[PDB]
Structures are given as C-alpha cells and as structure tokens.
Design a protein around this ligand. Structure first.
Ligand SMILES: Nc1ncnc2c1ncn2[C@@H]1O[C@H](COP(=O)(O)OP(=O)(O)CP(=O)(O)O)[C@@H](O)[C@H]1O
Length: 182
C-alpha cells in the first residue's frame, strides 16, 4: 500500500515543491522543483506599492524618498497581510509618518481582503508552474497524488489554499508536520 504525497512549501523567500513516495515492505524523493524568487516577501511588496499609491493619491507625497518611513510601511504591510488571512478587512495606521509645509502627516488606509487577493493573484499563479514540471519529471499526474501538505506561513492565506485545492482536486492538509507527513 504505497502512498505518494506532494509538499508545497512557500516561505518568506523561496518556493519549493517535492513529490515523495512511501512504501512499507522506504522513502524516495521522486522529484523536486521550485522558484528561488517567489516568497512571502513578494506578497508584502505588492501591498507596499498599493499603500504608497494611495498615500500619494490622498496627500500627494511620495514616501519612497524617505527611508525611515519605508521601513515602518514594510512592517505595517506585513502585519496587515497576516490579519487578512483571518479577517475580511483591516486598517493600516501609522501616525506622524512624514511631514510638509502643511504640517505632519498620518497614514490611515483600509485594506480589504478582496483588494489583497487581486494584488497578489499573479504570485499565486506563478507557484503552479513548477508544480506541473515536477509531476512531469516524476512521470505522474495529479490523480497519482494521494495527499497535499502545505508548509510555510504564507500558505495560511485562504487564496493560496483555494488555488492548490483546485489544481490537485483534493483539500490540502495544513495540519500535518514533517514526521506525520511521511
Ligand atoms: N497568517 C499568515 N497569513 C499569511 N502570511 C503569513 C501568515 N503568518 C505568517 N506569514 C508569512 O509567512 C512568512 C514566514 O515564512 P517561514 O518562516 O515559514 O519561512 P522562511 O521564510 O524562513 C524560509 P525561506 O526563506 O526558505 O522561504 C512571512 O513572509 C510572513 O509574512
């Protein structure tokens, strides 16, 4: 009774996919692929652009010339990205972010989940490309896979789970650890 699994591991920096076969009678990695420039940090970057554009649209300032402000906005963007894994909407609040002749300025922007999903949709789609490759290299199809286990914090995002569920046709398991997976 062999069991074949797929490990979708999306971290802060890189993306990995691995196909592993288990037999009783033994453990054999059948294929492994990924994307060295596709990670959670790219999800923050997309949200950072949106916050910079909205702050310009509203107040008229470009924060990118201000390095100390861009650090706080990166920190705030990640925080909002995470909350939006569990909430439908959230609020970025950074008082005294910058200043001009009119005085000190404040950021207060509402980000909805739907907004975030539209911003990162293409990054999620990039993760499917190495998946197809791995399966080809293994001489397998999605029907030959028995379980999909998610690894990495970024995979907690409902959208990422919905797309992986659509590819494999199975509900991926996010509860499983590395020992239990085998
Ligand atoms: N609830 C949540 N929803 C969405 N993203 C979340 C999250 N909780 C954490 N994250 C994201 O998960 C990432 C943390 O990744 P993790 O610690 O699992 O791997 P990593 O970055 O150390 C390994 P690598 O560099 O190889 O990819 C951060 O980018 C963080 O923004």
């Amino acid at each position: 009774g062999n069991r074949t699994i797929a490990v979708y591991d999306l971290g802060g920096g890189t993306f990995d996919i691995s196909i592993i076969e288990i037999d009783e009678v033994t453990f054999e990695v059948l294929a492994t692929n990924g994307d060295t420039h596709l990670g959670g940090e790219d999800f923050d970057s997309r949200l950072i652009n949106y916050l910079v554009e909205e702050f310009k649209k509203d107040q008229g300032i470009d924060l990118r010339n201000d390095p100390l402000a861009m650090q706080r906005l990166k920190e705030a963007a990640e925080k909002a990205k995470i909350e939006l894994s569990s909430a439908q909407q959230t609020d970025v609040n950074l008082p005294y972010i910058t200043a001009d002749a009119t005085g000190p300025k404040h950021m207060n922007i509402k980000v909805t989940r739907a907004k975030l999903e539209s911003l990162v949709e293409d990054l999620v789609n990039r993760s499917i490309e190495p998946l197809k490759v791995a399966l080809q290299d293994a001489g397998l199809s999605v029907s030959d896979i028995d379980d999909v286990i998610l690894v990495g914090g970024q995979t907690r995002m409902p959208m990422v789970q919905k797309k992986v569920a659509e590819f494999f046709g199975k509900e991926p398991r996010k509860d499983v650890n590395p020992d239990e997976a085998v």
